[PDB]
């Protein structure tokens, strides 16, 4: 083919259209309460009736679900109670609830394409990364239900894109665009941490990327001039204000909204001290008013303590070492009359290729450093910097979203690897531009064939496991056997 | 005072004498089976009657206990069964069993002094490190029982000393002394890993110290000449042979001894496949012979699998974050008639000072690097290199023996921090030579007063908690209250 801005735009539009198609196709088929739709639907409904409740997660995801429900006009009283009850016979708009994660997943694919486009890679690399995210069964299966992991993944991708936009403005510090993208990176990180607490890992990524930059900004002998200590102080203050203080303010604002919406007694009042019982205006009596900081501190301590002790066992808990190569998958919902399972797992071909390319990138960096120690360059200036500045950045994200799961010893599931795997899909694309590289990009035919073959193979693998992702077509017993690759408990054999 | 080789020798002799005094004083007082003397005494006895058994730990520690028992001549049939039965009314030499860990603890204090002496520090620094190890209640309490953690700590200290000896010979590579100390470092690491599997962490330390060295040996532009690739290949081959292959050979040799000693049926035969039942010569019948590698592989796989699933709950399991500052301690043995407890905990003053000095060293390194980035040296060549080569090495050991406990999520106890705390006692001494430094060592009076004050305070703290370490003097209820500093469950209040 060829390469031009028009081709970039055409590819981006097609990728976004196919993302919206795949995430929304058959979104209402399970039409029943599924693996963890129970809790989050309960909390979204409690938001709608303004009755107070208690949860261990930060509120923003359930606020988004409640906003989607409120937009339709549903208030109702169908607070979910058990896995396996029909939504349609209860006059509840579950499709409206499920449309938000689908929109966020489609926007996640678009943001992946935007990250690869903004970093400066060629069209085949952006297409490959966006297609690996597009044709992934785990991302599709997570953006299908009432689950707040899609919001987490979208916020992490948005933070990566915002920081890439901001870093390219390093030549015009303290300008309007500079401050705008700094604040936007902070806001994306704030949303990421206000969805789930594991979003803190994104703060590590953008943290590390900042620190290195600050180190580069602290060198007294650097090619781009030198900064006096007050100027570096201004830079550090700007980073701290835009990346630490604004995220905390947005987090606090989301709890302020949570407290303002909930002004009625409900299930979860007893977790608070009697003054908080007094301030809920127990209805369906006198009510007091407390300062916001006191209520926030009490709720935060209680939430941390309950997350420290209130753990419910699940048979499909996984360990971090099983994630990058898909050694085991989780099952969400199944009924025996139609022989339909919704067993949640990634795309085995895509995940294996992405992890293998992670290993190849590690080996390439090691070989380049070893050759440099001998005094051999072997890399152009442009191809070195990118491989350490852009691709390395992506490899940073993966690491910062994968390794911290070994330190945590509570229950973890495969979907916890969805953010990190996202970054894995980026380096892959970069490494296809790298090894098959002859603005110099004449005869991208090599990378074009590489990405075409890899994406066709991943597409075949996604087509193979598509029923298990959707659960619409009832599959025969021998067809269930064909999906038993690495010991997947499909329980229909 | 003054400084000279005679003063070094006098201090070393006094430190060793006091170590042997403190570790052996009242060694037979508990005169009863205690917290984990059960299992290890059982296995040492089974070694003595040559009856086969199964354990999850590598055999070397129980081989040492069985050798100590065999030296006296005891064979008997007193395989331990429950916590809290009298040794003396059963004609068993428990004092002989307990003398080995006491000897190893005294030698550990001596080896700490030797490490500080060989590295080049002044007398007050060596005295401070050796005294912090000497006046530590946790090290004393671990080298008191039939427990194989003292062997682990002694082997780690010996590996550190052996590698310091070897590295000083870097100017005469491939000589007899060079190879001798390389093999000795490998053998010390082999003993460390053949006692308990956590000894692998020492392989990290000496691993890292080697890697940096190899990096320095790989630089094509380095002050001390340049090595062609074959010469660096010879260096890497020597490191791999002395640090990887010899340790594995010694580990295999210890299993060979274990298999040769055990040629009778016993408790633990059923964990093996029927061929291994056939090779045990079931007595108290035909017996076959298997190749050693097959038996070793079967036993190793079974041991790993049982350690992966066979966990027994304990009420005093701790987490790594509680260790450096002694937030909680474990109780081993107690009887209510004499009001005697043997609650195991470190020396709070010594541990707090050691951890605080770890933090101070981190801050000092950070400040030095930050000042260097501005282009300010602020450190002499001699004082820089030491702080990064010797003291840093010690800080490496601590890290490599502490952080890997967060990755592991099984049950961990406070004694697991005994190796790492050892390295913490080294940096402390170094930092007392560092900050109070005016061969230039005129007027060490500052460091002399510093170490005198710190060691007097630690000695008072050790005297305060000495009954809880020994359990000989029955303490009153109000005296139990005085030891309730950071919430220690003494259960005699
Ligand atoms: C086990 C260890 C292993 C295997 C791997 C370790 C991980 C590794 C390798 C690295 C860790 C991560 C690293 C190093 C950095 C992450 C954070 C950083 C530094 C940045 C954040 C990412 C981020 C937005 C990077 C921005 C990159 C954008 C696309 C650059 C825009 O083009 P741009 O003009 O600057 O290119 C060049 O600009 C030069 C100007 O000077 C010029 O000279 C050249 O001609 C050329 O124009
Ligand atoms: C969060 C991060 C923080 C806070 C800390 C990070 C950890 C840090 C700071 C460091 C990590 C560990 C490091 C850097 C190294 C560990 C392993 C290494 C390199 C060695 C193993 C330890 C080890 C046996 C070191 C041996 C040191 C012996 C005592 C040196 C003997 O005296 P010697 O003549 O060589 O001194 C000088 O020899 C020069 C010759 O050139 C000469 O010029 C000088 O005049 C002067 O005679
Ligand atoms: C001086 C700075 C330097 C050197 C350089 C500049 C660095 C820079 C400019 C930016 C990044 C700075 C860095 C490295 C960190 C900053 C983030 C931080 C510590 C705070 C800011 C984040 C916030 C706005 C709110 C944090 C919420 C609070 C209050 C607590 C959370 C507790 C968490 C998150 C517990 C994680 C486990 C979780 C329980 C598992 C369950 O999991 P789940 O809920 O999913 O089931
Ligand atoms: C190429 C090399 C480079 C780059 C540079 C040169 C590096 C160099 C020269 C030296 C060091 C090399 C390094 C970094 C590692 C080498 C060690 C290694 C992996 C093997 C050698 C060690 C052996 C002789 C035997 C190992 C026993 C075996 C077979 C398995 C054990 C399993 C372990 C240990 C499981 C740890 C958890 C434990 C279960 C907790 C329970 O705990 P507990 O039992 O206490 O209750």
Author numbering:
A (entry chain B), B (entry chain A): 49 to 332, 541 to 694, 729 to 783
What does the paper say about this structure?
Protein O-mannosyltransferases (PMTs) are conserved endoplasmic reticulum membrane-embedded enzymes responsible for the transfer of mannose from dolichol phosphate-mannose (Dol-P-Man) to serine/threonine-rich protein substrates or unfolded proteins. PMTs from three subfamilies form obligate dimers with different substrate specificities and require the concerted action of their transmembrane domains (TMDs) and a luminal MIR domain for catalysis. Here, we present structures, native mass spectrometry, and structure-based mutagenesis of the fungal Pmt4 homodimer. The core fold of the TMDs and MIR domain is conserved with the Pmt1-Pmt2 heterodimer, indicating a shared catalytic mechanism.
